[PDB]
């Protein structure tokens, strides 16, 4: 599907070499092309054109460093292609350039195409490829921008990337998980592709680290900026706009801050007004001051010249909050402003705004996360407001709990955010951290591979059939600890994504093709297999990032009553989210006023709900690319035949949430205040309000599945549903028969004991085996399970599993 460009053959043609040379000379007489060349000559990269081309041509691996917007992303590919065209060998060029995000690959390809007076794709010189969407350029003498995830998928079809002549790894300083994997794969590939050219592009600082990693390959630095960008710190912002508000290693950095705090304020009084110093003193460092950002936006639009504004906020909750804060003011209601949120989980079509140039006198305001730190140009942006924070994952190998929080930005993220301005004219960057904070920021973020769960890392290593997982880890630039990888290996075995021999099962292959964590991937996969797609995607969307319920400090009683109403008799916090989501979808189409009244009455965040709606569409796209559904619509009827069956849904939840399994403790007393639990694997002992099942003294089964755990030593259960004992039997771990004696019992993972006929254990072993055969046949050419067949081997297997799950027995 996405391998169309890769699977082509690199076959240079002398006739096309002559056509490209003549076309280039014709371009040099075209007005629109000349004006683009005028802009290109202003870029710092243009002065280095001969040095860059000569160095890439003389060395297999090259490290190029330069400031943000120096021109690396849009120019280096063109310098390679145009040099080949001018030498009469343009058709020998098949250049692939990676971007960290899909919006970058699209916008950079459109910009390069425009710089060449061409449309993007359509068999022209430049195009892009992302998941399930492409504008492909011609076969030979072409440039293809894509995401690093696209190249990783390509390595499954051709581990040598045989038809690619140049591969340009951009933003390598952004040490994301996929980029570190790809970079290690490229390093191993060099000896197998002596004809391949590799270009590494990187921000000035620490660029030597990547040279050293690739055998001390030569480096070349592009100096300078195209335009100046003035930097303002928090004290400068408050002074300029006269703002008046309302009045382990990180632990020691805070002590340094607290120790230097009084002396910093003293020196701050010699340079700034006493009013602004008092405001800095009362600024809170735990959250971004969105009211300050709103006041700064007002000042820019009312006092500064035309130019778009780009705001960097940690996450979606801040973006929607600021968006509503602006839209509640009369000034921003008019069409003289266009306020555009930007989030990676938004649909691609919503993201493709922000690029259309604003007409004179109209102010564009983009509210983004760190997705906009990369080339999402545009750029008619003149003003950058850096909230000073970034959403980071932090994984504690103990308790196996990952925490997402708004951390202080690194100096690299700040420089990337400042660089978004000054791409076409002088700009301004406003940082919402004070000068003392700036001195205590890190140079770079910790690489993501050192601070996240590594289940996707191991699936990725395994699916590409490169080497053993131990040898590949040792080849990474920054290898993670062995204990973190074993925990991921252990988790993948409990999900049955790996077998006992640490080898991929058929399920693990499909999970490795889904770009989400395997627990979520297994849930949406079985939501597609069991034809209960829509409610499962809603549940999967709420397990990451969060549930839509917002319970103020005093409203627990009333909110619980509203939640038990939405729970009906499901005894399931996850189906409560389904019912809340469904009620919101109805109230949303009945006018914006009904939507607000519905969310207020049931203690719901309409902003979180909209995010859940966006993520459901992204999950369906993932299943489409993996061949498990026939369309991108989560409510497609062909994937929702069983969406009204609570038993099948609860089984799919269990398929995703195992081994997070909890046993209910029954108290002999009739009046049981709350429910006693124990999980033996965490080990939780209590269930936390506002859980629907807090006061439930009438459970149908003695087993619960859960997801969220709290980092505090006290072990709570945030959400849970009662699960059938046969769901744990089928979707669980190892099965065993035990004698009482004179009474046969079944065990799942030793600790889950049941009073069932012993032959059920043999049945589950056979149904698990049939399920593997079903998934194995899906590996070659994946197709959805055609449920209308009924008299099919795949439908009989899934029906037998569903029939076993649909069993009421305890």
PDB file of N, CA and C in Angstrom, residues 446-478:
ATOM      1  N   UNK A 446      15.727  14.410  27.509  1.00  0.00           N
ATOM      2  CA  UNK A 446      16.181  13.033  27.589  1.00  0.00           C
ATOM      3  C   UNK A 446      15.611  12.264  26.399  1.00  0.00           C
ATOM      4  N   UNK A 447      16.417  11.475  25.687  1.00  0.00           N
ATOM      5  CA  UNK A 447      15.876  10.689  24.571  1.00  0.00           C
ATOM      6  C   UNK A 447      14.705   9.834  25.030  1.00  0.00           C
ATOM      7  N   UNK A 448      13.671   9.777  24.186  1.00  0.00           N
ATOM      8  CA  UNK A 448      12.428   9.117  24.566  1.00  0.00           C
ATOM      9  C   UNK A 448      12.633   7.644  24.896  1.00  0.00           C
ATOM     10  N   UNK A 449      13.638   7.007  24.287  1.00  0.00           N
ATOM     11  CA  UNK A 449      13.878   5.589  24.528  1.00  0.00           C
ATOM     12  C   UNK A 449      14.346   5.337  25.955  1.00  0.00           C
ATOM     13  N   UNK A 450      14.779   6.381  26.663  1.00  0.00           N
ATOM     14  CA  UNK A 450      15.251   6.268  28.036  1.00  0.00           C
ATOM     15  C   UNK A 450      14.183   6.616  29.058  1.00  0.00           C
ATOM     16  N   UNK A 451      12.940   6.868  28.627  1.00  0.00           N
ATOM     17  CA  UNK A 451      11.965   7.364  29.592  1.00  0.00           C
ATOM     18  C   UNK A 451      10.533   6.925  29.291  1.00  0.00           C
ATOM     19  N   UNK A 452      10.331   5.925  28.441  1.00  0.00           N
ATOM     20  CA  UNK A 452       9.012   5.426  28.084  1.00  0.00           C
ATOM     21  C   UNK A 452       9.010   3.908  28.172  1.00  0.00           C
ATOM     22  N   UNK A 453       7.833   3.292  28.307  1.00  0.00           N
ATOM     23  CA  UNK A 453       7.749   1.831  28.181  1.00  0.00           C
ATOM     24  C   UNK A 453       8.193   1.381  26.801  1.00  0.00           C
ATOM     25  N   UNK A 454       8.831   0.213  26.740  1.00  0.00           N
ATOM     26  CA  UNK A 454       9.535  -0.153  25.521  1.00  0.00           C
ATOM     27  C   UNK A 454       8.848  -1.290  24.776  1.00  0.00           C
ATOM     28  N   UNK A 455       7.542  -1.475  24.990  1.00  0.00           N
ATOM     29  CA  UNK A 455       6.842  -2.546  24.289  1.00  0.00           C
ATOM     30  C   UNK A 455       6.826  -2.315  22.783  1.00  0.00           C
ATOM     31  N   UNK A 456       6.597  -1.067  22.350  1.00  0.00           N
ATOM     32  CA  UNK A 456       6.615  -0.775  20.918  1.00  0.00           C
ATOM     33  C   UNK A 456       8.014  -0.882  20.344  1.00  0.00           C
ATOM     34  N   UNK A 457       9.024  -0.572  21.157  1.00  0.00           N
ATOM     35  CA  UNK A 457      10.406  -0.724  20.723  1.00  0.00           C
ATOM     36  C   UNK A 457      10.734  -2.178  20.426  1.00  0.00           C
ATOM     37  N   UNK A 458      10.308  -3.092  21.296  1.00  0.00           N
ATOM     38  CA  UNK A 458      10.636  -4.496  21.076  1.00  0.00           C
ATOM     39  C   UNK A 458       9.862  -5.066  19.899  1.00  0.00           C
ATOM     40  N   UNK A 459       8.584  -4.707  19.762  1.00  0.00           N
ATOM     41  CA  UNK A 459       7.832  -5.152  18.594  1.00  0.00           C
ATOM     42  C   UNK A 459       8.468  -4.635  17.310  1.00  0.00           C
ATOM     43  N   UNK A 460       8.956  -3.391  17.332  1.00  0.00           N
ATOM     44  CA  UNK A 460       9.591  -2.815  16.151  1.00  0.00           C
ATOM     45  C   UNK A 460      10.888  -3.547  15.820  1.00  0.00           C
ATOM     46  N   UNK A 461      11.723  -3.797  16.831  1.00  0.00           N
ATOM     47  CA  UNK A 461      12.969  -4.535  16.614  1.00  0.00           C
ATOM     48  C   UNK A 461      12.688  -5.924  16.038  1.00  0.00           C
ATOM     49  N   UNK A 462      11.634  -6.583  16.526  1.00  0.00           N
ATOM     50  CA  UNK A 462      11.329  -7.961  16.141  1.00  0.00           C
ATOM     51  C   UNK A 462      10.732  -8.046  14.744  1.00  0.00           C
ATOM     52  N   UNK A 463       9.860  -7.098  14.401  1.00  0.00           N
ATOM     53  CA  UNK A 463       9.162  -7.120  13.122  1.00  0.00           C
ATOM     54  C   UNK A 463      10.112  -6.843  11.960  1.00  0.00           C
ATOM     55  N   UNK A 464      11.205  -6.112  12.182  1.00  0.00           N
ATOM     56  CA  UNK A 464      12.089  -5.866  11.054  1.00  0.00           C
ATOM     57  C   UNK A 464      13.104  -6.973  10.809  1.00  0.00           C
ATOM     58  N   UNK A 465      13.129  -8.019  11.631  1.00  0.00           N
ATOM     59  CA  UNK A 465      14.020  -9.158  11.412  1.00  0.00           C
ATOM     60  C   UNK A 465      15.465  -8.712  11.189  1.00  0.00           C
ATOM     61  N   UNK A 466      15.938  -7.790  12.023  1.00  0.00           N
ATOM     62  CA  UNK A 466      17.283  -7.254  11.808  1.00  0.00           C
ATOM     63  C   UNK A 466      18.329  -8.167  12.434  1.00  0.00           C
ATOM     64  N   UNK A 467      18.394  -8.167  13.758  1.00  0.00           N
ATOM     65  CA  UNK A 467      19.195  -9.124  14.489  1.00  0.00           C
ATOM     66  C   UNK A 467      18.478  -9.485  15.767  1.00  0.00           C
ATOM     67  N   UNK A 468      19.179 -10.126  16.695  1.00  0.00           N
ATOM     68  CA  UNK A 468      18.610 -10.333  18.011  1.00  0.00           C
ATOM     69  C   UNK A 468      18.357  -9.013  18.710  1.00  0.00           C
ATOM     70  N   UNK A 469      17.367  -9.014  19.606  1.00  0.00           N
ATOM     71  CA  UNK A 469      17.028  -7.773  20.290  1.00  0.00           C
ATOM     72  C   UNK A 469      18.163  -7.316  21.190  1.00  0.00           C
ATOM     73  N   UNK A 470      18.988  -8.244  21.674  1.00  0.00           N
ATOM     74  CA  UNK A 470      20.108  -7.832  22.506  1.00  0.00           C
ATOM     75  C   UNK A 470      21.188  -7.149  21.687  1.00  0.00           C
ATOM     76  N   UNK A 471      21.519  -7.696  20.520  1.00  0.00           N
ATOM     77  CA  UNK A 471      22.556  -7.067  19.715  1.00  0.00           C
ATOM     78  C   UNK A 471      22.113  -5.700  19.204  1.00  0.00           C
ATOM     79  N   UNK A 472      20.842  -5.563  18.820  1.00  0.00           N
ATOM     80  CA  UNK A 472      20.392  -4.278  18.293  1.00  0.00           C
ATOM     81  C   UNK A 472      20.355  -3.205  19.373  1.00  0.00           C
ATOM     82  N   UNK A 473      19.927  -3.562  20.586  1.00  0.00           N
ATOM     83  CA  UNK A 473      19.943  -2.593  21.677  1.00  0.00           C
ATOM     84  C   UNK A 473      21.342  -2.028  21.892  1.00  0.00           C
ATOM     85  N   UNK A 474      22.362  -2.900  21.874  1.00  0.00           N
ATOM     86  CA  UNK A 474      23.749  -2.490  22.090  1.00  0.00           C
ATOM     87  C   UNK A 474      24.274  -1.574  20.991  1.00  0.00           C
ATOM     88  N   UNK A 475      23.615  -1.535  19.840  1.00  0.00           N
ATOM     89  CA  UNK A 475      24.030  -0.699  18.723  1.00  0.00           C
ATOM     90  C   UNK A 475      23.353   0.662  18.735  1.00  0.00           C
ATOM     91  N   UNK A 476      22.326   0.834  19.564  1.00  0.00           N
ATOM     92  CA  UNK A 476      21.640   2.111  19.672  1.00  0.00           C
ATOM     93  C   UNK A 476      22.601   3.169  20.201  1.00  0.00           C
ATOM     94  N   UNK A 477      22.327   4.424  19.844  1.00  0.00           N
ATOM     95  CA  UNK A 477      23.125   5.530  20.360  1.00  0.00           C
ATOM     96  C   UNK A 477      23.028   5.602  21.879  1.00  0.00           C
ATOM     97  N   UNK A 478      21.809   5.558  22.412  1.00  0.00           N
ATOM     98  CA  UNK A 478      21.570   5.525  23.855  1.00  0.00           C
ATOM     99  C   UNK A 478      20.750   4.288  24.198  1.00  0.00           C
TER     100      UNK A 478
END
